[PDB]
Amino acid sequence: SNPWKAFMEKYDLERAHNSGIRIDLGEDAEVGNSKYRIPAGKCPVFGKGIVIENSKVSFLTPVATGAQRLKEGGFAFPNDHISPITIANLKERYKENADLMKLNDIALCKTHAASFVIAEDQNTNYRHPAVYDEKEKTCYMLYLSAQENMGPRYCSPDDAMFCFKPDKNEKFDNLVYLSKNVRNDWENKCPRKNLGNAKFGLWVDGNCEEIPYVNEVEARSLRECNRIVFEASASDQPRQYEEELTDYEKIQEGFRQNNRDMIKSAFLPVSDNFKSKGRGYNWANFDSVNNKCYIFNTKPTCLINDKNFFATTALSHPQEVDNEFPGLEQKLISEE
């Protein structure tokens, strides 16, 4: 009988998250004529952002408009004043909604972004993803659901181009990448902090054993190990994915022309086998002393108390640590 069973439910990311992490495109959504995939993840992704190649422009900057080339803007809404919105203004806006007033900041931000529809559209399941900036208490609505455009035709050393990749780096620490499906009760159902003095294990015959199969990768810090596991996690799109028909000029035209459907579907792949459903190398045990990152793809079912280690996941914050090792395995002993 496993004492860890309920505690470990939040580390069952196939069930907890149920979509891609590095690239989340787990749900089919109609945009105009065609069917595309959009983020479907039920867990927030802490520390994740989109990096635009050869651009100093943040992806949180609004999408290009008018004269601006694609590379002069980001992925966000260009502004009813709905994005970027602060949590103060958010709380103010929905003060009459009881249910929304019981939501935490991250859930409120996601709820706000996922609420906006075009009435004159044939009520689709498409909704905009979000990015919550915890430091600034600001909620961004993303115009683009697309997470990576790194294909070797256009996105190899050869300016009218718009190449981008998902990434975890210091500039993104306080960001939370949010799909329209992020759980309101994510705080109890999803990971956030790295578990200090802990390593994930597998409950076998009344004891917490090591993960049977792992991939050792060199990592010099907690940040580095957390980045490795994100980079190896469940992905809904293969690396270097590219479509032949992709026309940057038509796309850039659609943006300058404020064509909502073209902007919305920009760089999105068009099948069910491309969906990870949460399966992948999502967990890692970082050995802070020997500088090793042991990534694995089978869900952990217990924790081992080991002061040399940290238990991280692809969803987890790049730095935040919970050093409180759970005592749920400690037994009552008698003085007698």
Residue numbers in the entry: 52 to 130, 133 to 211, 216 to 327, 332 to 397
Q: Please, what does the article write about this entry?
A:
Apical Membrane Antigen 1 (AMA1), a type 1 transmembrane protein of the Plasmodium parasite, includes an ectodomain, a transmembrane region and a cytoplasmic domain. The ectodomain comprises three domains referred to as Domain 1, Domain 2 and Domain 3. AMA1 is produced in the microneme organelles and transferred to the parasite surface just prior to or during red blood cell (RBC) invasion. AMA1 appears to be essential for invasion since, for several Plasmodium species, antibodies raised against the ectoplasmic region of the protein have been shown to inhibit invasion, and immunization with AMA1 in animal models protects against infection.
The free PkAMA1 protein crystallized in space group C2 with two molecules (A and B) in the asymmetric unit and the structure was refined at 2.45 Å resolution. The polypeptide chain of molecule A was traced from Ser52 to Glu397 (thus including eight residues of the c-myc tag), with main-chain gaps Ala131-Asp132, Ser212-Lys215 and Gly328-Asn331 due to conformational mobility. Molecule B was built from Ser52 to Asp398 with main-chain gaps Ser212-Ala217 and Gly328-Ser332. The two molecules are very similar, with an r.m.s.d. of 0.34 Å in Cα positions over the 332 common residues in the PkAMA1 sequence. The D2 loop of PkAMA1, which is displaced upon binding of the RON2 component of the RON receptor complex in the homologues TgAMA1 and PfAMA1, could be completely traced in both molecules except for the short region Gly328-Ser332. Nonetheless, the high temperature factors of this region indicate a propensity to structural mobility. Interestingly, the D2 loop adopts a different conformation in PkAMA1 to that which has been observed in PfAMA1. This could be due to sequence differences between the two homologues or could arise from inherent flexibility in this region of AMA1.
